[PDB]
């Protein structure tokens, strides 16, 4: 299913963006290293038009669904960050190449007791991380999911008070604000 190779945040009533937090615009957020947009768009690029359709004052939902719906050649007008510059760009959709990287990456248990784990992940650097949120719950079993957070400058956390010899699903989310970056990372562990 042809893809453009980048993610967008923002939109009127949307969940904001880490580039110009005051601006509800549509912003290029993550760009895939080997994909269609990688030598053309950058993080923080505000989309103002795509294939003739204005992205000014657009809702996030509609922006995603227009982008997904477009032919294969998508022509964008972006504003790049004084100061600002308006730029037209052509991006051709790709079948094609890649599963997207996870955010953060390389989640692992490095030490364990019967009821405690030290987990670590690779520090996510491409975008501002205000905190990491860690959740853990018993794998596919009737159990709620428990969660806590560590500062964005931390790359390990301890999970405590686990029941001994149970399977737990552990997820780590990189949060800019209340909401997190796409592709949060998960492992399971007995």
């Amino acid at each position: 299913s042809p893809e453009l190779g980048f993610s967008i945040s923002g939109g009127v009533g949307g969940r904001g963006n880490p580039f110009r937090p005051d601006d509800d615009g549509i912003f290029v957020t993550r760009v895939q290293p080997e994909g269609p947009a990688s030598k053309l768009l950058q993080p923080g690029d505000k989309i103002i038009q795509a294939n003739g359709y204005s992205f000014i004052n657009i809702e996030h939902g509609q922006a995603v669904s227009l982008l997904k719906t477009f032919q294969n050649t998508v022509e964008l007008i972006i504003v790049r960050e004084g100061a600002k510059q308006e730029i037209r760009v052509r991006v051709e959709k790709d079948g094609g190449s890649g599963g997207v990287s996870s955010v953060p990456t390389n989640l692992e248990v490095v030490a364990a007791t019967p009821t405690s784990l030290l987990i670590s992940w690779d520090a996510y650097r491409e975008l501002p991380v205000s905190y990491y949120r860690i959740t853990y719950g018993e794998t596919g079993g009737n159990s709620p999911v428990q969660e806590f957070t560590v500062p964005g400058s931390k790359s390990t956390a301890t999970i405590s008070g686990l029941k001994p010899g149970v399977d737990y699903t552990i997820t780590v989310y990189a949060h800019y604000n209340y909401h997190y970056y796409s592709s949060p990372i998960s492992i399971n562990y007995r």
């Binding site: 993610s7 945040s9 995603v64 800019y176 909401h179 796409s182």
Partner: peptide, 8 residues
């Protein structure tokens, strides 16, 4: 919470 960004 939800993702702040969506892939296209």
């Amino acid at each position: 919470p939800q993702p702040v960004d969506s892939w296209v």
